[PDB]
Amino acid sequence: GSHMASKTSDLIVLGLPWKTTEQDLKEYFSTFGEVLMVQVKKDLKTGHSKGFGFVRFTEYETQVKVMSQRHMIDGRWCDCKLPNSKQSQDEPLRSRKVFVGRCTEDMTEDELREFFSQYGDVMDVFIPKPFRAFAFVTFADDQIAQSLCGEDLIIKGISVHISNAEPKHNSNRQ
Template sequence: MDTEETESCAQDPRKMFVGGLSWQTTQERLLEYFGRFGDVKDCTVMRDPVTKRSRGFGFVTYEDQAGVDKVLAQGKHELDSKTIDPKVAFPRRAQPKLVTRTKKVFVGGLSVSTSIEDVRHYFGQFGKVQDAMLMFDKTTNRHRGETKPGLKQD
Protein backbone atom coordinates (compact mmCIF):
# COMPACT_ATOMS: atom_id res chain seq x y z
CA MET A 1 0.00 0.00 0.00
CA ASP A 2 1.53 3.33 -0.97
CA THR A 3 1.48 6.46 1.21
CA GLU A 4 -1.40 8.09 -0.63
CA GLU A 5 -3.58 4.98 -0.26
CA THR A 6 -2.69 4.73 3.43
CA GLU A 7 -3.67 8.35 3.99
CA SER A 8 -7.02 7.90 2.23
CA CYS A 9 -7.84 5.00 4.60
CA ALA A 10 -6.77 6.93 7.70
CA GLN A 11 -9.33 8.73 9.80
CA ASP A 12 -9.54 12.48 9.19
CA PRO A 13 -10.47 14.04 12.56
CA ARG A 14 -11.80 17.09 10.70
CA LYS A 15 -14.48 15.09 8.82
CA MET A 16 -17.94 14.61 10.28
CA PHE A 17 -20.82 12.32 9.33
CA VAL A 18 -24.20 14.03 9.69
CA GLY A 19 -27.19 11.70 9.97
CA GLY A 20 -30.90 12.40 10.23
CA LEU A 21 -31.03 15.14 7.60
CA SER A 22 -34.39 16.28 6.28
CA TRP A 23 -35.08 15.18 2.71
CA GLN A 24 -35.27 18.92 1.91
CA THR A 25 -31.87 19.85 3.35
CA THR A 26 -29.58 21.16 0.62
CA GLN A 27 -25.81 21.31 0.53
CA GLU A 28 -26.09 25.09 0.89
CA ARG A 29 -28.17 24.80 4.09
CA LEU A 30 -25.75 22.20 5.50
CA LEU A 31 -22.82 24.53 4.79
CA GLU A 32 -24.68 27.51 6.27
CA TYR A 33 -25.48 25.61 9.49
CA PHE A 34 -22.08 24.01 10.07
CA GLY A 35 -20.22 27.15 8.97
CA ARG A 36 -21.27 28.69 12.30
CA PHE A 37 -18.83 26.35 14.07
CA GLY A 38 -15.74 26.99 11.91
CA ASP A 39 -14.35 27.24 8.39
CA VAL A 40 -15.78 24.41 6.28
CA LYS A 41 -13.41 22.88 3.73
CA ASP A 42 -15.97 20.54 2.13
CA CYS A 43 -19.66 19.80 2.54
CA THR A 44 -21.82 17.16 0.82
CA VAL A 45 -25.41 15.92 1.09
CA MET A 46 -25.39 12.33 -0.17
CA ARG A 47 -27.90 11.70 -2.95
CA ASP A 48 -29.26 8.63 -4.69
CA PRO A 49 -27.37 8.33 -8.00
CA VAL A 50 -30.54 7.55 -9.97
CA THR A 51 -33.28 9.67 -8.38
CA LYS A 52 -30.95 12.42 -7.09
CA ARG A 53 -33.06 12.46 -3.91
CA SER A 54 -31.27 13.04 -0.61
CA ARG A 55 -30.30 9.87 1.24
CA GLY A 56 -30.79 11.65 4.58
CA PHE A 57 -27.13 12.03 5.50
CA GLY A 58 -24.06 13.98 4.53
CA PHE A 59 -20.47 14.87 5.37
CA VAL A 60 -18.83 18.08 6.55
CA THR A 61 -15.05 18.57 6.64
CA TYR A 62 -13.58 21.49 8.56
CA GLU A 63 -10.35 23.32 7.81
CA ASP A 64 -9.18 22.45 11.32
CA GLN A 65 -10.12 20.29 14.31
CA ALA A 66 -11.55 23.24 16.28
CA GLY A 67 -14.73 23.24 14.16
CA VAL A 68 -15.41 19.59 14.96
CA ASP A 69 -14.78 20.22 18.67
CA LYS A 70 -17.32 23.08 18.68
CA VAL A 71 -19.95 20.92 16.95
CA LEU A 72 -19.42 18.08 19.44
CA ALA A 73 -19.52 20.49 22.41
CA GLN A 74 -23.06 21.53 21.50
CA GLY A 75 -25.45 18.83 22.67
CA LYS A 76 -28.40 19.10 20.31
CA HIS A 77 -28.41 20.10 16.64
CA GLU A 78 -31.50 20.96 14.60
CA LEU A 79 -31.60 21.77 10.89
CA ASP A 80 -34.70 22.25 8.72
CA SER A 81 -36.97 21.28 11.65
CA LYS A 82 -35.20 17.94 12.24
CA THR A 83 -32.84 16.87 14.98
CA ILE A 84 -29.62 15.87 13.24
CA ASP A 85 -26.80 13.66 14.50
CA PRO A 86 -23.27 14.89 13.68
CA LYS A 87 -20.34 12.68 14.71
CA VAL A 88 -16.73 12.20 13.72
CA ALA A 89 -16.62 10.15 10.49
CA PHE A 90 -14.71 6.88 10.36
CA PRO A 91 -13.58 5.30 7.10
CA ARG A 92 -15.58 2.16 6.28
CA ARG A 93 -12.53 -0.13 6.32
CA ALA A 94 -11.41 1.14 9.73
CA GLN A 95 -14.76 0.57 11.43
CA PRO A 96 -15.13 -2.54 13.50
CA LYS A 97 -18.04 -4.76 12.46
CA LEU A 98 -20.10 -3.76 15.52
CA VAL A 99 -19.34 -0.21 16.57
CA THR A 100 -22.27 -0.05 19.01
CA ARG A 101 -24.93 -2.48 20.11
CA THR A 102 -28.24 -1.66 18.49
CA LYS A 103 -31.61 -3.31 18.29
CA LYS A 104 -32.44 -1.72 14.95
CA VAL A 105 -31.94 -3.26 11.53
CA PHE A 106 -32.39 -1.39 8.24
CA VAL A 107 -33.85 -3.47 5.43
CA GLY A 108 -33.97 -2.16 1.85
CA GLY A 109 -35.30 -3.48 -1.44
CA LEU A 110 -38.63 -4.78 -0.14
CA SER A 111 -41.39 -5.48 -2.61
CA VAL A 112 -44.27 -2.98 -2.48
CA SER A 113 -46.52 -5.92 -1.61
CA THR A 114 -44.51 -6.69 1.56
CA SER A 115 -46.60 -5.98 4.65
CA ILE A 116 -45.49 -5.10 8.16
CA GLU A 117 -46.78 -8.54 9.22
CA ASP A 118 -44.47 -10.16 6.63
CA VAL A 119 -41.51 -8.28 8.13
CA ARG A 120 -42.44 -9.22 11.71
CA HIS A 121 -42.91 -12.88 10.75
CA TYR A 122 -39.61 -13.15 8.88
CA PHE A 123 -37.49 -11.44 11.55
CA GLY A 124 -39.31 -13.29 14.33
CA GLN A 125 -37.22 -16.36 13.55
CA PHE A 126 -34.11 -14.48 14.81
CA GLY A 127 -35.57 -13.08 18.04
CA LYS A 128 -38.55 -11.24 19.46
CA VAL A 129 -39.50 -8.30 17.23
CA GLN A 130 -40.08 -5.35 19.53
CA ASP A 131 -41.18 -2.90 16.84
CA ALA A 132 -41.26 -2.66 13.05
CA MET A 133 -42.18 0.11 10.67
CA LEU A 134 -42.41 0.67 6.94
CA MET A 135 -41.24 4.02 5.61
CA PHE A 136 -43.94 5.62 3.43
CA ASP A 137 -43.52 8.06 0.57
CA LYS A 138 -45.76 11.06 1.32
CA THR A 139 -46.57 11.72 -2.33
CA THR A 140 -47.54 8.19 -3.41
CA ASN A 141 -48.71 6.96 0.04
CA ARG A 142 -46.88 3.66 -0.64
CA HIS A 143 -43.97 2.31 1.34
CA ARG A 144 -40.54 2.96 -0.11
CA GLY A 145 -39.22 -0.61 0.00
CA GLU A 146 -37.34 -0.17 3.25
CA THR A 147 -38.10 -0.90 6.87
CA LYS A 148 -36.54 -0.65 10.30
CA PRO A 149 -37.49 -3.62 12.50
CA GLY A 150 -36.36 -3.51 16.09
CA LEU A 151 -35.16 -6.92 17.27
CA LYS A 152 -35.12 -7.76 20.96
CA GLN A 153 -32.55 -10.34 21.98
CA ASP A 154 -33.78 -12.63 24.79
Protein backbone atom coordinates (compact mmCIF):
# COMPACT_ATOMS: atom_id res chain seq x y z
CA GLY A 1 0.00 0.00 0.00
CA SER A 2 0.94 3.68 0.39
CA HIS A 3 -0.91 4.68 3.59
CA MET A 4 -2.06 3.30 6.97
CA ALA A 5 -4.98 3.24 9.42
CA SER A 6 -6.16 1.85 12.77
CA LYS A 7 -9.37 0.96 14.66
CA THR A 8 -11.97 3.75 14.78
CA SER A 9 -13.60 5.45 17.78
CA ASP A 10 -15.42 8.65 18.73
CA LEU A 11 -13.51 11.86 19.46
CA ILE A 12 -14.32 13.45 22.80
CA VAL A 13 -15.18 17.15 22.55
CA LEU A 14 -13.82 18.65 25.77
CA GLY A 15 -14.15 22.31 26.77
CA LEU A 16 -17.73 22.98 25.61
CA PRO A 17 -19.39 26.22 26.85
CA TRP A 18 -21.90 23.93 28.67
CA LYS A 19 -24.67 25.50 26.51
CA THR A 20 -23.98 24.52 22.87
CA THR A 21 -26.48 22.00 21.43
CA GLU A 22 -25.52 18.63 19.92
CA GLN A 23 -26.16 19.34 16.25
CA ASP A 24 -24.04 22.53 16.37
CA LEU A 25 -21.08 20.20 16.93
CA LYS A 26 -21.89 18.24 13.75
CA GLU A 27 -22.58 21.55 11.94
CA TYR A 28 -18.81 22.18 12.17
CA PHE A 29 -17.27 18.68 12.42
CA SER A 30 -18.44 18.28 8.80
CA THR A 31 -15.29 20.30 7.94
CA PHE A 32 -13.26 17.05 8.09
CA GLY A 33 -15.55 14.33 6.69
CA GLU A 34 -19.26 13.44 6.68
CA VAL A 35 -19.88 12.98 10.46
CA LEU A 36 -21.91 9.79 10.92
CA MET A 37 -23.22 11.29 14.19
CA VAL A 38 -22.66 13.39 17.33
CA GLN A 39 -23.73 12.86 20.95
CA VAL A 40 -23.29 15.45 23.71
CA LYS A 41 -22.49 13.80 27.04
CA LYS A 42 -22.91 14.94 30.65
CA ASP A 43 -24.02 13.76 34.12
CA LEU A 44 -26.92 11.43 34.99
CA LYS A 45 -28.33 13.15 38.10
CA THR A 46 -27.26 16.76 37.40
CA GLY A 47 -27.08 16.74 33.60
CA HIS A 48 -24.22 19.23 34.10
CA SER A 49 -20.95 17.48 35.09
CA LYS A 50 -18.97 16.21 32.06
CA GLY A 51 -19.20 19.35 29.86
CA PHE A 52 -18.19 17.43 26.73
CA GLY A 53 -19.41 15.56 23.66
CA PHE A 54 -18.73 12.82 21.17
CA VAL A 55 -18.43 12.84 17.39
CA ARG A 56 -17.92 9.93 14.96
CA PHE A 57 -16.83 9.77 11.31
CA THR A 58 -16.86 7.39 8.32
CA GLU A 59 -13.08 6.84 8.47
CA TYR A 60 -10.10 6.79 10.82
CA GLU A 61 -8.11 9.60 9.20
CA THR A 62 -11.01 11.94 9.96
CA GLN A 63 -10.42 11.06 13.64
CA VAL A 64 -6.69 11.88 13.70
CA LYS A 65 -6.63 15.27 11.93
CA VAL A 66 -9.13 16.95 14.29
CA MET A 67 -7.01 16.03 17.33
CA SER A 68 -4.03 17.74 15.65
CA GLN A 69 -5.22 21.08 17.11
CA ARG A 70 -7.98 22.96 18.99
CA HIS A 71 -11.29 24.27 17.60
CA MET A 72 -13.73 27.13 18.22
CA ILE A 73 -17.33 26.16 19.01
CA ASP A 74 -20.06 28.76 19.64
CA GLY A 75 -17.24 31.21 20.49
CA ARG A 76 -15.41 28.93 22.96
CA TRP A 77 -12.09 27.14 22.56
CA CYS A 78 -12.42 23.37 22.87
CA ASP A 79 -10.34 20.26 22.12
CA CYS A 80 -10.87 16.88 20.45
CA LYS A 81 -8.98 13.64 21.13
CA LEU A 82 -9.19 9.87 21.74
CA PRO A 83 -10.97 8.85 25.01
CA ASN A 84 -9.58 6.57 27.74
CA SER A 85 -11.84 3.62 26.80
CA LYS A 86 -11.04 2.88 23.11
CA GLN A 87 -8.15 2.41 20.63
CA SER A 88 -7.08 -0.44 22.97
CA GLN A 89 -8.47 -3.61 21.35
CA ASP A 90 -7.29 -6.48 19.13
CA GLU A 91 -9.96 -9.19 18.94
CA PRO A 92 -13.14 -10.50 20.66
CA LEU A 93 -14.07 -14.16 21.38
CA ARG A 94 -16.61 -16.69 20.06
CA SER A 95 -20.23 -16.61 21.26
CA ARG A 96 -23.90 -16.12 20.24
CA LYS A 97 -24.27 -13.27 22.75
CA VAL A 98 -22.72 -9.82 22.94
CA PHE A 99 -22.66 -6.97 25.50
CA VAL A 100 -23.27 -3.23 25.10
CA GLY A 101 -21.89 -0.11 26.84
CA ARG A 102 -22.38 3.69 27.05
CA CYS A 103 -26.09 2.86 26.60
CA THR A 104 -28.75 5.59 27.00
CA GLU A 105 -32.48 5.90 27.70
CA ASP A 106 -32.98 7.15 24.11
CA MET A 107 -33.03 3.52 22.87
CA THR A 108 -34.69 0.27 24.02
CA GLU A 109 -34.61 -3.53 23.63
CA ASP A 110 -36.63 -3.70 20.40
CA GLU A 111 -34.70 -0.83 18.78
CA LEU A 112 -31.41 -2.60 19.49
CA ARG A 113 -32.65 -5.84 17.88
CA GLU A 114 -34.01 -3.82 14.94
CA PHE A 115 -30.52 -2.41 14.36
CA PHE A 116 -28.52 -5.59 15.10
CA SER A 117 -30.58 -7.51 12.49
CA GLN A 118 -28.72 -5.73 9.66
CA TYR A 119 -25.57 -7.78 10.35
CA GLY A 120 -27.44 -11.12 10.19
CA ASP A 121 -30.27 -12.25 12.48
CA VAL A 122 -31.05 -11.46 16.14
CA MET A 123 -32.58 -13.89 18.64
CA ASP A 124 -33.24 -11.32 21.39
CA VAL A 125 -32.01 -8.30 23.38
CA PHE A 126 -31.95 -7.84 27.15
CA ILE A 127 -31.72 -4.81 29.46
CA PRO A 128 -32.07 -5.12 33.28
CA LYS A 129 -33.55 -2.39 35.51
CA PRO A 130 -33.16 0.28 36.55
CA PHE A 131 -31.55 1.70 33.39
CA ARG A 132 -27.72 1.65 33.34
CA ALA A 133 -24.85 2.23 30.88
CA PHE A 134 -25.15 -1.32 29.44
CA ALA A 135 -27.22 -4.05 27.76
CA PHE A 136 -26.95 -7.44 26.01
CA VAL A 137 -27.97 -9.03 22.70
CA THR A 138 -28.17 -12.54 21.21
CA PHE A 139 -27.48 -13.52 17.59
CA ALA A 140 -28.48 -16.48 15.40
CA ASP A 141 -24.87 -17.39 14.57
CA ASP A 142 -21.68 -17.91 16.56
CA GLN A 143 -19.78 -15.76 14.03
CA ILE A 144 -21.95 -12.62 13.91
CA ALA A 145 -21.53 -12.13 17.68
CA GLN A 146 -17.78 -12.71 17.13
CA SER A 147 -17.53 -10.18 14.27
CA LEU A 148 -19.51 -7.33 15.88
CA CYS A 149 -17.87 -7.07 19.32
CA GLY A 150 -15.65 -4.05 20.10
CA GLU A 151 -16.88 -2.33 16.91
CA ASP A 152 -18.09 0.90 18.63
CA LEU A 153 -21.54 0.68 16.97
CA ILE A 154 -24.24 3.37 16.58
CA ILE A 155 -27.99 3.27 17.33
CA LYS A 156 -30.29 6.03 15.97
CA GLY A 157 -27.35 8.40 16.52
CA ILE A 158 -26.20 7.00 19.89
CA SER A 159 -22.70 5.57 19.61
CA VAL A 160 -22.62 2.49 21.85
CA HIS A 161 -19.62 0.39 22.83
CA ILE A 162 -19.77 -3.40 22.45
CA SER A 163 -17.87 -6.09 24.35
CA ASN A 164 -17.60 -9.80 25.16
CA ALA A 165 -20.67 -10.89 27.13
CA GLU A 166 -19.99 -13.39 29.92
CA PRO A 167 -22.33 -16.19 31.08
CA LYS A 168 -24.11 -15.74 34.42
CA HIS A 169 -25.69 -19.13 33.56
CA ASN A 170 -24.95 -21.96 31.09
CA SER A 171 -21.65 -21.96 29.12
CA ASN A 172 -20.21 -21.56 25.60
CA ARG A 173 -20.35 -24.32 22.93
CA GLN A 174 -16.94 -23.88 21.23
